[PDB]
Design an enzyme around this catalytic site. Structure first.
Site, short mmCIF file in Angstrom:
data_model
loop_
_atom_site.label_atom_id
_atom_site.label_comp_id
_atom_site.label_asym_id
_atom_site.label_seq_id
_atom_site.Cartn_x
_atom_site.Cartn_y
_atom_site.Cartn_z
N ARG B 237 43.65 35.89 34.31
CA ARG B 237 42.90 35.66 33.06
C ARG B 237 42.60 34.16 32.94
O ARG B 237 43.33 33.39 33.45
CB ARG B 237 43.53 36.35 31.85
CG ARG B 237 44.80 35.73 31.29
CD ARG B 237 45.11 36.27 29.89
NE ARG B 237 44.03 35.95 28.96
CZ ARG B 237 44.07 36.01 27.64
NH1 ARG B 237 44.06 37.19 27.03
NH2 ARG B 237 44.07 34.90 26.92
N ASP B 261 38.18 34.58 39.55
CA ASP B 261 37.33 35.63 38.99
C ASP B 261 37.22 35.53 37.47
O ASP B 261 36.44 36.26 36.87
CB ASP B 261 37.89 37.02 39.38
CG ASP B 261 36.97 38.17 39.01
OD1 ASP B 261 35.79 38.11 39.43
OD2 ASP B 261 37.42 39.14 38.34
N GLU B 266 36.11 32.20 28.79
CA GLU B 266 36.10 33.60 28.36
C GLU B 266 37.06 33.90 27.21
O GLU B 266 37.12 35.05 26.77
CB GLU B 266 36.46 34.52 29.53
CG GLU B 266 35.47 34.53 30.68
CD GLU B 266 35.91 35.50 31.77
OE1 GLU B 266 35.27 36.57 31.92
OE2 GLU B 266 36.91 35.19 32.46
N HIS B 293 33.74 37.63 36.97
CA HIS B 293 34.57 38.68 36.39
C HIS B 293 34.29 40.03 37.05
O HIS B 293 33.97 41.01 36.37
CB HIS B 293 34.37 38.75 34.87
CG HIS B 293 35.55 39.28 34.11
ND1 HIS B 293 36.17 38.57 33.12
CD2 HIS B 293 36.21 40.46 34.21
CE1 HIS B 293 37.17 39.28 32.63
NE2 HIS B 293 37.22 40.43 33.27
N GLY B 295 36.50 41.75 38.99
CA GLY B 295 37.74 42.37 39.45
C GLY B 295 37.71 43.89 39.46
O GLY B 295 38.33 44.52 40.30
N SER B 296 37.02 44.50 38.50
CA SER B 296 36.89 45.95 38.52
C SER B 296 35.44 46.40 38.68
O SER B 296 35.10 47.53 38.30
CB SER B 296 37.49 46.56 37.26
OG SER B 296 36.77 46.14 36.13
#
Ligand SMILES: NC(=O)c1ccc[n+]([C@H]2O[C@@H](COP(=O)(O)OP(=O)(O)OC[C@@H]3O[C@H](n4ccc(N)nc4=O)[C@H](O)[C@@H]3O)[C@@H](O)[C@H]2O)c1
Lengths: 329, 329
Positions: B237, B261, B266, B293, B295-296
């Site tokens: 994060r 990432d 943020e 961002h 990661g997923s």
């Protein structure tokens, strides 16, 4: 049949309804702590437990509750849980982060202002019915231009410094981990050693975690280094401050006041521990200001803490890995 | 007339088809975030809303959407929602399970390899048209025989350790709660203190679970303990890493590189957040590797997230208690 969830303390009715969809809920309908024997009786055939600060989850507790699959703690600090015993017994242990920080910082500033401005004795004078206008009494100590020191610049310490940044004070802190340059400039806080902090401060605010090294961190030796007529504000943890040395420092005039949201008596984990707040502190209404561990006692915050603990229970009971897990059963 | 559902961000066509059976769907056909005024304009007469990371739902939003009955968040958390405002307005708020663990672990290892092997600069040299064969350039750092440390050993840390177990590295980790002995042997990962980890590691990967997040875990003090020439990879994060301390460590040579990432800009809940990624990081293509961002950002995972959010909306619109509810309106 639905799994059963036991809540050891009162929770908002919405939280009971939320849990009720996937579990049969056994709430504590009172605002009191139940004796351990009654908590265990309710939890013996429970699949889940929402635990609070007064609960001590040890191996003996877990042996009495063989169906438990998750303990959703409505807490941040898990000192009162035997995590490895939870793991060995196949019990998820989850916590709630972050939510206590800001209301505790806000309460600490309230204790500071209430104590230094004699606000409690002021309210008592109003309630007496004898108010007839201004009198030359209850002269207190102001904030602007004074020196306040934060021992422990962590989550609560940083929340306090951010809020006091607008009060035109001289703010000091000590911590083995320094803030960065942007933070020190934003809040106008200067890093010093603990000895320098105790030497220079009108107001001293400990915000360290309780550890072997911080047991009675504010003892007779620390108070002797402090400025005569200083104030000490304690909302961190009960045994970080030696309450008997405080009593002596108020009697001698070293401390002009002491305010606290926490007390040594609530540290049930130490053997040398009193079961009541010392009477010399309770009687000294002129120089003290106390609250009964109200640091996070904000309705909207308690609701979100309960919601996080409930969601962890729901997730664990559904076979997911709960968001606040600290172990792996 | 069917109820109306507004999707604030793009979803896969099969999700729109799934919702179309019981609702009239108003999609975002673009990959852009709509301005708040347009979301409200679409949702003013909607019965349901599917919300994403960029959305923020406050009381003022809900006052403008008097027909709303459910907000189905395509998110495992709810920091951007005033949950109690939803409750008071009669609006279900739902989340989805945490499905992000493995794609985040895979992306973290991609960041590690891309950064340490100079792959971005390598690709630039290929596209420049000037490649004429092997040259003694772009020599990087390898994995085998090197020491990598994972700070925090929750779900994602465990996924990373499992995947790096085959790379013949020296794997270290720190966490207040230890891994199982079977996992430590299976992945050849050794528990150390944070100080030992920072001292020994060629590669440092902060990956703290949600219950253990703290601001600037990697700060100037931590970076001064790390090995000169080390690499830092942050897919955890934004707030976990002090990006200005990292800029200084790259400038001094303490860090050979940084990959991320996630970014401090943020953190919309933190008061003192930045609003750009620092220019000194963006300019430093030689020593950094960044992803927006992602990661997923894996199709299978994004689809299942959308599917769970849609099912919650469908359940709530049919008058059931939705499976992912976090409130009771
Ligand atoms: N009344 C309430 O209801 C209430 C509510 C919430 C919390 N609490 C209390 O429980 C603790 C957690 O507070 P915290 O701020 O959340 O903890 P942390 O972030 O780890 O602390 C900063 C740390 O200080 C350290 N350190 C360590 C040793 C040393 N000699 N000097 C240091 O300086 C170290 O470096 C680090 O910065 C107290 O703070 C207090 O707030 C009470």
């Amino acid at each position: 049949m639905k799994p059963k969830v036991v809540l050891t303390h009162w929770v908002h009715p919405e939280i009971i309804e939320l849990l009720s969809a996937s579990a049969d809920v056994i709430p504590n309908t009172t605002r009191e702590t139940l004796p351990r024997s009654e908590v265990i009786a309710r939890a013996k055939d429970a699949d889940a437990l929402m635990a609070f600060m007064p609960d001590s989850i040890d191996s003996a507790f877990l042996e009495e509750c063989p169906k438990l699959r998750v303990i959703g703690a409505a807490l941040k600090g898990y000192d009162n849980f035997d995590v490895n015993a939870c793991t060995r017994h196949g019990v998820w242990l989850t916590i709630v982060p972050d939510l206590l920080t800001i209301p505790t910082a806000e309460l600490t500033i309230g204790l500071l202002l209430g104590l230094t401005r004699h606000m409690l004795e002021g309210d008592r004078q109003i309630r007496s019915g004898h108010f007839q206008g201004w009198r030359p009494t209850l002269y207190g100590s102001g904030l602007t231009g004074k020196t306040l020191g934060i021992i422990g610049m962590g989550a609560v310490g940083r929340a306090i410094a951010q809020r006091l940044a607008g009060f035109e004070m001289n703010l000091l802190y000590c911590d083995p981990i320094p803030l960065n340059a942007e933070q020190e400039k934003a809040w106008h806080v200067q890093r010093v050693t603990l000895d320098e902090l105790l030497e220079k401060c009108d107001y001293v605010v400990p915000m360290v975690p309780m550890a072997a090294e911080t047991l009675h961190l504010i003892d007779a030796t620390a108070l002797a280094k402090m400025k005569t007529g200083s104030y000490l504000i304690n909302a961190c943890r009960g045994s970080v401050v030696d309450e008997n040395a405080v009593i002596a420092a108020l009697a001698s005039g070293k401390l002009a006041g002491y305010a606290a949201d926490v007390f040594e008596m609530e540290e049930w984990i130490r053997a040398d521990r009193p079961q009541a707040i010392p009477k010399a502190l309770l009687d000294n209404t002129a120089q003290t200001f106390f609250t009964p561990h109200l640091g996070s006692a904000v309705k909207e915050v308690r609701l979100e803490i309960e919601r996080q603990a409930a969601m962890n229970i729901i997730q664990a009971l559904a076979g997911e890995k709960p968001m606040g897990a600290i172990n792996q059963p």
